[PDB]
Design a protein around this ligand. Structure first.
Ligand SMILES: [Zn+2]
Ligand SMILES: [Zn+2]
Ligand SMILES: [Zn+2]
Length: 79
DNA sequence: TCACACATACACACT
DNA sequence: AAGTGTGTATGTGTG
């Protein structure tokens, strides 16, 4: 078992390390276009969509691609 | 081979 | 309306 700087003892090393990296504020994944640094890969992956303009999540009726999952979920809820 | 174990991506939920 | 954090299912690695 792997203790952390919060009292949470994680089962797996990797989860402790992810948690600690968040604690420190380390941001190893930076954008090579704008210059913002993110602490996790998928954060930077999602952010890249604004540089690359990829607009996924096509609405099933209204035909409105959205960049972000929550925006698409709200539009599907409303429309 | 293969049975298992841990890392990592990705959905999903927040701020 | 994009950044931040968590939980978990593959995928890869290994003995
Ligand atoms: Zn911690
Ligand atoms: Zn960027
Ligand atoms: Zn619609």
């Amino acid at each position: 078992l792997y203790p952390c700087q919060c009292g949470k003892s994680f089962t797996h090393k990797s989860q402790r390390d992810r948690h600690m990296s968040m604690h420190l504020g380390l941001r190893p994944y930076g954008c090579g276009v704008c210059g913002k640094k993110f602490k996790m890969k998928h954060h930077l992956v999602g952010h890249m969509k604004i540089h690359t303009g990829i607009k996924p999540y096509e609405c099933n009726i209204c035909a409105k691609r959205f960049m972000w999952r929550d925006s698409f979920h709200r539009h599907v809820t409303s429309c």
